[PDB]
Amino acid sequence: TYKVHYFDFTGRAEPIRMILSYGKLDFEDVRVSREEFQKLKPTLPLGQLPVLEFQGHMIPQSTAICRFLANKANLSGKDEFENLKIDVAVDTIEDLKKKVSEWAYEKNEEKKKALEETTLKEHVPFFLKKLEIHAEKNGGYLALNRISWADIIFLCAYETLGNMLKKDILIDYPNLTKVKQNILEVPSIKEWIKKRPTNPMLSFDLKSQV
Amino acid sequence: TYKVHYFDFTGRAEPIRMILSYGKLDFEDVRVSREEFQKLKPTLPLGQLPVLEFQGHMIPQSTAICRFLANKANLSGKDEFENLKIDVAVDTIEDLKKKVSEWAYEKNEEKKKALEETTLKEHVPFFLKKLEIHAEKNGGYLALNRISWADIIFLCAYETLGNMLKKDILIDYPNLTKVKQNILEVPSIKEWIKKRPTNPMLSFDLKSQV
16 A cells, blocks of 8 residues: 655645545555654655655655656556656646745745745746646646646645635636646545645635535 | 757756767757847747757756656666656755755855855765665666666766865765766767867866766
């Protein structure tokens, strides 16, 4: 059985959980507090979470894990080129997440305020418009005209960015909203969103959309 | 034919070029100056380099490009799980480069001195010790006990980190030095390193090791 070791939040592990749920792959969701994490860190392959326990192996690096599990869940591409398109979409989403995190987690207040205008008005729209053009071209997916793990990465990124920015990020992006709907309509994803724990520190919870 | 569009230096494109060379995949290395880049940037899918031109497509995201090209060069894994081993190794190398780059390009000296201490004394040895245990276990490769694209990523990171730290980083990591040797011994990689342009901004050039 798979075991997902992570903190108690929809962080880098939420896409792992959602891909496992999509594939109906039975798994343990091991939610570790910060103190247990401090105790565990010297034993963690990179001193980092999340880790996938599989076949007795502790496997780090969430994106590599997501790509791996996507083969088991039929969320991967059929050929090298479909996989390249998904990888491109995932890395584009990760770039977006990184700029918004760089701003949001900036700690010098003066730099954070200066960075806010540029982050909210330029970077976020730039990347979302590129993804919007792709969503239009593929009939409501970010790649391959069908559900792929890129779309799960995108749905989880949407939730994360919504909590960081305190706004629905897709309000001006109707094709990305269709992507969102198409993925929320998938029964196993709906089930996961209903079953998963509520985090009261989250103001943006996808549970309110299902 | 492949085109690698990048600046005239061994950036994020060097692993792309070296993988193409390994496979005898004919390519033009289009080295664009910054002024040409200033004019060209609005036409780049992400306004960024590198880009692979292939079959009329401008494909961004170097790591996705490298993974795609690894299938063409017989540098990919034979199954999903070997690919997972390669991806995990690549992402660990990228994490090391991230910590060292965060230190090296910081311009406010106070954050820079502190980052020097923590980066050189903690992070770099930690990641090198991890990569070293894998290199020992796999007989002189970083993954799969055979050449993979992970080993090319590692060789290019070796060059980059050597230039940022101004030291041979593998002197105390004999199995990673064996990785380096094994990869530099590959005829097409040696041929590429011999043929490739000299960059006068590099103090650490692999040309001196072949």
